[PDB]
C-alpha cells in the first residue's frame, strides 16, 4: 500500500469500496466539507499495479472547553481484496503521524455496541472504551455506540 491525498473525483472510482454493506456513501457536501476543513485527514490507500484505491480514512479535529482539541475518526473502510493484512490499522495509525493530529489531546471514534469486531480492532491499536452514547441508511444509527479514545503523547 501507498498513501495518497483524497480528491473529489476519487468518488467516481470508489464503488468497489463503497458498495460494501457497512460503508455509507455520503452526500457530495459531506465529503467536500472534510476536504475543505481537514484536507490532510482525508487520505486513501492505493495498491500496485494500477493505483486503485484500496481504502480511505476520513477524520477531523474538534474543539472543546475551545481550549482543548481532539481528533475524531468518522470513516475507515478497506476494499475486500485487501483485508486482514493490517491496512485498516495502518490508516488509523497514520493519523498519529500528522502534526495537526499530534497537536490534539486524543483520538476518539464511535463503534456500535454490537460491533465487537470494530472494538477489538481499535483496542489492538491502543484505544479503550471511554463512554456509552445513545445513537439517536446502511447502519442503524439508533443503536448505542461506544466512544473509544486513544490518548496522544
Amino acid at each position: 500500500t501507498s498513501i495518497k491525498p483524497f480528491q473529489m473525483e476519487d468518488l467516481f472510482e470508489l464503488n468497489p469500496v463503497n458498495l460494501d454493506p457497512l460503508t455509507e456513501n455520503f452526500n457530495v457536501s459531506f465529503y467536500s466539507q472534510y476536504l475543505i476543513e481537514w484536507p490532510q485527514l482525508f487520505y486513501k490507500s492505493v495498491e500496485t499495479p494500477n493505483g486503485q484505491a484500496s481504502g480511505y480514512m476520513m477524520a477531523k479535529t474538534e474543539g472543546q472547553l475551545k481550549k482543548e482539541w481532539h481528533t475524531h475518526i468518522t470513516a475507515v473502510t478497506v476494499l475486500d481484496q485487501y483485508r486482514r493484512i493490517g491496512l485498516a490499522s495502518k490508516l488509523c495509525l497514520e493519523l498519529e503521524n500528522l502534526t495537526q493530529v499530534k497537536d490534539t489531546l486524543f483520538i476518539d471514534l464511535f463503534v456500535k455496541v454490537t460491533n465487537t469486531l470494530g472494538r477489538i480492532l481499535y483496542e489492538k491499536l491502543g484505544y479503550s472504551v471511554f463512554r456509552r452514547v445513545v445513537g439517536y441508511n446502511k447502519i442503524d444509527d439508533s443503536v448505542d455506540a461506544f466512544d473509544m479514545r486513544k490518548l496522544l503523547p
Binding site: 500500500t1 501507498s2 498513501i3 495518497k4 491525498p5 480528491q7 473529489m8 473525483e9 468518488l11 467516481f12 472510482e13 464503488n15 468497489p16 463503497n18 458498495l19 460494501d20 454493506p21 457497512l22 456513501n25 455520503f26 452526500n27 457530495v28 457536501s29 467536500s32 466539507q33 476536504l35 475543505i36 484536507p39 490532510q40 487520505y43 495498491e47 500496485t48 499495479p49 476494499l79 475486500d80 481484496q81 485487501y82 483485508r83 486482514r84 493484512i85 493490517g86 495502518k90 495509525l93 497514520e94 503521524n97 502534526t99 469486531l117 441508511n137 446502511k138
Partner: protein, 732 residues
Amino acid sequence: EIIDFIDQGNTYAQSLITKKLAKSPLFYHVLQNEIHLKSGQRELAIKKNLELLNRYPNDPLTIEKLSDFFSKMEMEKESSLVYENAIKKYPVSTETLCLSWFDNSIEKYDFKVFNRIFMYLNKNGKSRLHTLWYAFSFHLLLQEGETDKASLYNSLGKKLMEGLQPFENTQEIYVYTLFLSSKEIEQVLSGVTLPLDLELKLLYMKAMKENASFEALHAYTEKLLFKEKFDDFDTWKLWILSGKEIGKSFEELDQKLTLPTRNISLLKIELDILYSRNIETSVENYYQKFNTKLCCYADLSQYELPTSFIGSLKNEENLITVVNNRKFVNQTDNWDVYERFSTKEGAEYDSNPVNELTLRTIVSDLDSSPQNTIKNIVLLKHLLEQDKYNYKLKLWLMKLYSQLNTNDLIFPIYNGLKIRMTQHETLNYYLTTTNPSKINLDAWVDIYRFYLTSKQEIKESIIQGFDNGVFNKLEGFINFSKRMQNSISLNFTVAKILQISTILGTDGYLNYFIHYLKTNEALIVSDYTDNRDFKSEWNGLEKIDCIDVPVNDVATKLKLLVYSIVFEDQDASRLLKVFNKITSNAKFSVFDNLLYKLYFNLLKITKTKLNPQETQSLYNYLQKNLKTDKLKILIPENLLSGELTQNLTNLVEFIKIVKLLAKRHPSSYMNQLVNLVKPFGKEFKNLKLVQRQHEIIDSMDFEPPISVDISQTKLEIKSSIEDCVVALLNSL
C-alpha cells in the same frame, strides 16, 4: 419580482404587468420588457439589450440578467462588459460585483472569466486571498492548452505568488509549485521551514527523482521510512532506486529489510529486479507469508512469475490459499472448491472468498444464449442466499436480467445495494431496461433529485474552497462539477422520466422536465460526459468480452431532442438539423434507424412550415411503415432477448407522441396516423410473444453444476415477462 416569475412561466399578462410597472418608473423593468420581446422575437431584444448595456446599469440584478442574456446569445464579449463597465464606473462595489459575477459564472467553467474576475478583484483588492485566487486561476487556464499564452500565464502566476512570501501554509506553497520547474520545486521545498503535508512531500520526492537528486532522495525517503513510520510502497521503491543510483550494494539495502511486512516482502522482489537478480526466492517468500490473504494473487501477478513457482500447482485446507492458487493457474472449473466451502462463515457482512472462484466460473460460462443466462441467474441467486451482501454477484445478476424481458426484477437488487447520491451517477445504467411503472418513475425522480442536490452542494463546495484557501482540492471540486453538469447518466435519467411519464398518463412530472430541456438546450445538443462504472463487477477478475447492459447513448440524446422539438413553439428547424446530423451517424439497429426516421418525419410535418409536397413525401413514408407488418422487425428472432420490450417500449412512446401531436397540430394526415396506430395493440397481442417465450422456457433443459431449484426462478421469470410485456401491449 413576483411579476417577473409569472413572465418566465409564461405570457400575455407579463407584457402588460411590465408595461404597467415600467410606466410607473427602472433599468430592470426595461431589461424585463426586452426579455419578454426575446420570448416573442429576438433581433429587437439584442438591439434593446445592447441599448441597456451602454446606459451602464449599476444594479446587481440587472447586470446579472444582461450578462445572462448576452451569454445566452453567444455574445461573451457583452456578457463580460456589463460587469466590467460597472466595476470601472463604481470601483467601491468591486468586491460585491466580482463575487456575484463569480458565483453566477461557476456553472460556466470559463477559466478566462475566472481569471478576468480575479484580475479586477485583485486590483481593487487588499487581499492576500484574492491574490492567491488570481494566481491559482492562471494554473486553471494553463490546464486548457492555448500553448501560445502558456509562458505568460506561468510568469504572471509565479510572480504573484513570489509577492506573497514568506508563505504561511502548505496551500500557498502548493500554488507556487504550479508554476515551477522540477529543479525549482526541489530548491523551494528544500528550504521550507513549515512542516510539509503529504501533497508536498510526494511532490518533493517526485521532483528529486526527476532532477536525479538521488542522494537527497535516498536520505529523505530513508527518514520517512525508518524514522517517521510512514511504511509507503512508492516511497520504498524510490529508496531502493536512489540507493542504487548513489552506489549502494544490494546487501547494504537488503540488510535494512528486516521486518516481514507486506510492503517489504514485495520490495524484495522489486530489489531483485533492480539489481538484475533472480526473482524466484523472493516470490516464494512473499507467497509463503501471504497465500492465506486475498491480496496474494494481485500482488504477485503484476510481476513475471517463473514457471517453476507456478509448477507448484500440485494438490488444500485454507480456502484463500486455494483461491489464490486457482487464480495463479487460471482455473475456471471451481465448483469442487465451492462444494467444500459453500457455507458462509466468519463475519456476517463479509463476502465468502469462494465466490471469487464461482464468479470466474460463471463469467467464463456465459455465452449469451437465454438458457445459459437463465441457468446462471439461478446460480447467482443461489450463491446470494448464503453470501447475501456480495455486490459483484448482485451487479452480475442485474446484467443477466438486463439480457431478458424480466425488467421487473432489477430495481429490487439495485435498491438492496443502497445505491445513493453519487453512486446513481456511476451505476444508473444498470436500470436501463427497467419497466415503465409508476413506482419506477418515482424512483427515477428521486435519482434526479440527487442531481439537483449534488449541483447545489458542489457549487457551495467551490465557493467555500475558494473562501478558505484549499487550492490542494479546488481543481477536483471544479472538475467534479464539470463532469456532473451534462453527464450521459443525468440525461438518461431525464430521458427515462419523460418516457415513463408519457407511457403512463402522468403529466405532473412532464412539465417540469420539458422546462429543463428548453432551459438547457445548449447542453442537450453538446457531448455528454461519461462517469459510468463498467469496472466494479470485474474487480479481481480479468475483464473479457461478455454480455453488456444494453445502453444506447445516441438514442438518449435523440429522445431529448424529440421532446425538445415537440414542445418548441417558435422555430424547431435548428433542433431538427441537430437531430438529422445525429441520425446520419448514429450506429443503430435496423429498427432504431426506422424509429428515428419516423420521428424525424413526424416532427417536421407537425413542427415546421413545409410546402404541401414536402409534407406529403415525409407523410407517405409514415403511412407506408406505421403497420405491424413493417414494425414486426422490432421483434428479435430470440424472443427472450430484452430488445423485445426495449423496442416495444419505444414504439409505445412513439405512438403516445403521435397522439399528442395530433391534438396540438390537427390535420387530416395526423388523424390518419392516429387511425393507423389503432390496431397495433390487437395485432401485436395476436403474435403471442408471452406464450412463445413461456414455451421456450418450459422446453429448456437444465443440468446445473450444483444442487439448485430451477422451478421457482422459471416461474418468477415467466410471470415477470408476462407482466412487463402485457403492460406494454395494453399501452399500444
